[PDB]
Structure 1
């Protein structure tokens, strides 16, 4: 029993790897027409020595989006999904 599934044009949706960061160390917010993602952790030991990291990303949202409709989920594997 074989069917092809057509791939449609979908809404705003991004995947970000953030496995190095705890939930409290990651902030996702809507500012204006951008979704911002800020992530930061202070010095921490890994296998090599000590490491501290920080990034800031911005994604432009599409026109017809209510900010209260933007959602986010963090998989156990540390992948952040953001949709709108």
Structure 2
């Protein structure tokens, strides 16, 4: 579970990709003119999924304040609220 500021990038411009044990956020601009001049920008941020989550249970969403969140549940294998393997 993790959060990243993306206010600099459009929601449409922003994309997230998950592959096995890794995550990849990617963004890009087109020389957008701000008060100081033209500002082209792009980046790639990555993360590793902890064993408490899997690449099929993950969720991704964006708040209006400009913060992207990558989320997943906590896999309780022992104690109360025990988990059960949903089979497809």
Normalising to structure 2: TM-score of the pair? 0.74
Name the CA distance, whole Å, in 2 between partners of 1:65 and 1:75: 22
Per the TM alignment, residue 64 of structure 1 is displaced from its structure 2 partner at its CA by 4.9
Q: Which residue of 2 aligns with 1:50?
A: 38
| Structure 1 moving runs of 4+ over 2 Å | 63-66
RMSD value, Cα: 1.2
Which structure ranks higher in relative contact order (CA pairs < 8 Å, sequence separation ≥ 6)?
1
Name the CA distance, whole Å, in 1 between partners of 2:65 and 2:52: 31
Normalising to structure 1: TM-score of the pair? 0.77
How many residue pairs get aligned? The number is 72
What secondary structure does 2:56 align onto? Answer: helix
More strand by share: 1
More helix by share: 1
Name the CA distance, whole Å, in 1 between partners of 2:35 and 2:8: 13
